[PDB]
Scaffold this active site. Structure first.
Site, PDB file in Angstrom:
ATOM      1  N   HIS A 185       0.874  -1.194  -0.232  1.00 38.26           N
ATOM      2  CA  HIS A 185       0.009  -0.117   0.032  1.00 38.26           C
ATOM      3  C   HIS A 185       0.800   1.423  -0.058  1.00 38.26           C
ATOM      4  CE1 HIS A 185      -3.375  -2.788   1.676  1.00 38.26           C
ATOM      5  NE2 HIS A 185      -3.406  -2.504   0.227  1.00 38.26           N
ATOM      6  N   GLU A 199       1.420   3.657   3.230  1.00 40.77           N
ATOM      7  CA  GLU A 199       2.231   2.886   4.539  1.00 40.77           C
ATOM      8  C   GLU A 199       3.530   2.793   4.354  1.00 40.77           C
ATOM      9  OE1 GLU A 199       0.030  -0.868   4.559  1.00 40.77           O
ATOM     10  OE2 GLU A 199      -1.729   0.031   4.228  1.00 40.77           O
ATOM     11  N   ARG A 212      -3.487   4.715  -1.952  1.00 38.61           N
ATOM     12  CA  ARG A 212      -3.177   3.384  -1.301  1.00 38.61           C
ATOM     13  C   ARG A 212      -3.262   2.187  -2.583  1.00 38.61           C
ATOM     14  NH1 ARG A 212      -5.090  -0.298   2.421  1.00 38.61           N
ATOM     15  NH2 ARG A 212      -6.507  -1.962   1.849  1.00 38.61           N
ATOM     16  N   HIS A 272       2.909  -4.035   6.517  1.00 35.58           N
ATOM     17  CA  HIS A 272       2.054  -2.917   6.442  1.00 35.58           C
ATOM     18  C   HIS A 272       2.213  -1.910   7.746  1.00 35.58           C
ATOM     19  CE1 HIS A 272      -0.589  -5.083   3.358  1.00 35.58           C
ATOM     20  NE2 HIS A 272       0.396  -5.922   3.403  1.00 35.58           N
ATOM     21  N   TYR A 313     -10.600  -7.548  10.406  1.00 38.10           N
ATOM     22  CA  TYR A 313     -11.785  -7.504   9.651  1.00 38.10           C
ATOM     23  C   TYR A 313     -11.805  -8.531   8.581  1.00 38.10           C
ATOM     24  CZ  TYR A 313      -8.519  -4.065   7.246  1.00 38.10           C
ATOM     25  OH  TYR A 313      -7.667  -3.373   6.891  1.00 38.10           O
ATOM     26  N   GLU A 365       1.359  -4.990  10.979  1.00 37.46           N
ATOM     27  CA  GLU A 365       0.784  -3.540  11.029  1.00 37.46           C
ATOM     28  C   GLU A 365       1.499  -3.129  11.916  1.00 37.46           C
ATOM     29  OE1 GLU A 365      -3.085  -2.552   9.130  1.00 37.46           O
ATOM     30  OE2 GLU A 365      -1.009  -2.494   8.699  1.00 37.46           O
TER      31      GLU A 365
HETATM   32  N1  LIG Z   1      -6.379 -10.743   4.054  1.00 35.59           N
HETATM   33  C1  LIG Z   1      -6.361  -9.611   4.860  1.00 35.59           C
HETATM   34  N2  LIG Z   1      -7.100  -8.547   4.383  1.00 35.59           N
HETATM   35  N3  LIG Z   1      -5.339  -9.484   5.509  1.00 35.59           N
HETATM   36  C2  LIG Z   1      -4.928  -8.289   6.101  1.00 35.59           C
HETATM   37  C3  LIG Z   1      -4.325  -8.354   7.347  1.00 35.59           C
HETATM   38  C4  LIG Z   1      -4.170  -7.204   8.382  1.00 35.59           C
HETATM   39  C5  LIG Z   1      -4.262  -5.961   7.748  1.00 35.59           C
HETATM   40  C6  LIG Z   1      -4.494  -5.895   6.454  1.00 35.59           C
HETATM   41  C7  LIG Z   1      -4.623  -4.400   5.607  1.00 35.59           C
HETATM   42  C8  LIG Z   1      -3.494  -4.032   5.503  1.00 35.59           C
HETATM   43  S1  LIG Z   1      -3.349  -2.094   5.213  1.00 35.59           S
HETATM   44  C9  LIG Z   1      -5.325  -4.448   4.452  1.00 35.59           C
HETATM   45  O1  LIG Z   1      -4.990  -5.012   3.561  1.00 35.59           O
HETATM   46  O2  LIG Z   1      -6.320  -3.827   4.258  1.00 35.59           O
HETATM   47  C10 LIG Z   1      -5.062  -6.906   5.702  1.00 35.59           C
HETATM   48 ZN   LIG Z   2      -1.511  -2.328   3.806  1.00 31.19          ZN
END
Ligand SMILES: N=C(N)Nc1cccc([C@@H](CS)C(=O)O)c1
Ligand SMILES: [Zn+2]
Length: 305
Positions: A65, A68, A123, A193, A245, A267
């Site tokens: 991203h 980041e 992003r 990230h 999420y 993260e």
């Molecule tokens: N399969 C996933 N979505 N994994 C995942 C786990 C932790 C953080 C994220 C963020 C990172 S910005 C993101 O990609 O939005 C994704």
């Molecule tokens: Zn990310």
């Protein structure tokens, strides 16, 4: 140009550093392009380790991203720490002797350049979408892992656009191709990230847990404990869907589903005070603590071959 490990460097500078750091350490680093971005930028990969026959590897990428920036900085920091301590620090010495570290400095080079030239908070990638003026696909929504089934948008104008199809982006398809062609040696997948201060593991595209859920929990738990030693930084960890999420198309889930049992999404700082605009003044402390977690996980994976 003008590279610094305690400052955020533009792509021109990062690419130069990739070339320089390799020329300076021929014994420990080999540089390679694994594809090109939508806009013509070379997607570099650095193979860090003492060359030897049929060695296992740990793959780490940064720069998924664009905004980041702390992740881009971490990949760079890691490379220097690896070469300066090799031969002096026993763990790093044993790591480079035994395995190869695939370090991909920046995947989303196109979006990175965009945060530098026009939009700091960008992003997604910078690719074109048919039938719209809207630019970009979220790269961590473009993998073949319950692709676009949840936590992803089907609208190109949205920040979480899942792409027209899985691996639609040259960057993700190039990363996927590489991982598929080296599956045999790749033992762990680490994707860097920010922000939130967390260590996540599969699955995010679903509420089901991976087979080694408890092992990954113990490991994520141990790693966060390591990182906290240095400056008391508190990280949370757990399966994506419940820790952060449900979101489909993540590369961590995908790699896990390829058979890579140790798959983590990191993260880094902050928790939200600065968010994506983390002060360069925190680069060193961030990278230092994070190094302990990555090395902790490397030592576990290594001693579990
Ligand atoms: N399969 C996933 N979505 N994994 C995942 C786990 C932790 C953080 C994220 C963020 C990172 S910005 C993101 O990609 O939005 C994704
Ligand atoms: Zn990310």
């Amino acid at each position: 140009t003008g590279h610094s490990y305690e400052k955020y460097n533009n792509w021109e500078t990062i690419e130069a550093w990739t070339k320089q750091v390799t020329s300076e350490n021929p014994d420990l680093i080999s540089r390679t392009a694994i594809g090109t971005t939508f806009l013509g930028n070379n997607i570099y990969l650095l193979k860090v380790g003492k060359p030897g026959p049929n060695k296992p590897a740990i793959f780490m990428d940064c720069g998924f991203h664009a905004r980041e920036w702390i992740s881009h900085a971490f990949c760079q920091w890691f490379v220097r720490e690896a070469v300066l301590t090799y031969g002096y620090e026993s763990h790093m010495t044993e790591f480079l002797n035994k395995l190869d570290f695939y370090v991909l400095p920046v995947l989303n080079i196109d979006g990175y350049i965009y945060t530098w030239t026009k939009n700091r908070m960008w992003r997604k990638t910078r690719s074109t979408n048919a039938g719209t003026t809207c630019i970009g696909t979220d790269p961590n929504r473009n993998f073949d892992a319950g692709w676009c089934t949840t936590g992803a948008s089907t609208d190109p104008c949205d920040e979480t656009y899942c792409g027209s199809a899985a691996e639609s982006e040259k960057e993700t398809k190039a990363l996927a191709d590489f991982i598929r062609n080296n599956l045999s040696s790749i033992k762990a997948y680490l994707t860097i990230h920010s922000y939130s201060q967390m260590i996540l593991y599969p699955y995010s595209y679903d509420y089901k847990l991976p087979e080694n859920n408890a092992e990954l929990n113990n490991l994520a738990k141990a790693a966060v404990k390591e990182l906290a030693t240095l400056y008391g930084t508190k990280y949370t960890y757990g399966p994506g869907a419940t820790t952060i999420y449900p979101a489909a198309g993540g590369s961590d889930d995908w790699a896990y589903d390829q058979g890579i049992k140790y798959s983590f999404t990191f993260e880094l700082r902050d928790k939200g005070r600065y968010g994506f605009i983390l002060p360069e003044s925190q680069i060193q402390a961030t990278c230092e603590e994070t190094m302990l977690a990555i090395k902790y996980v490397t030592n576990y994976v290594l001693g579990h071959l």
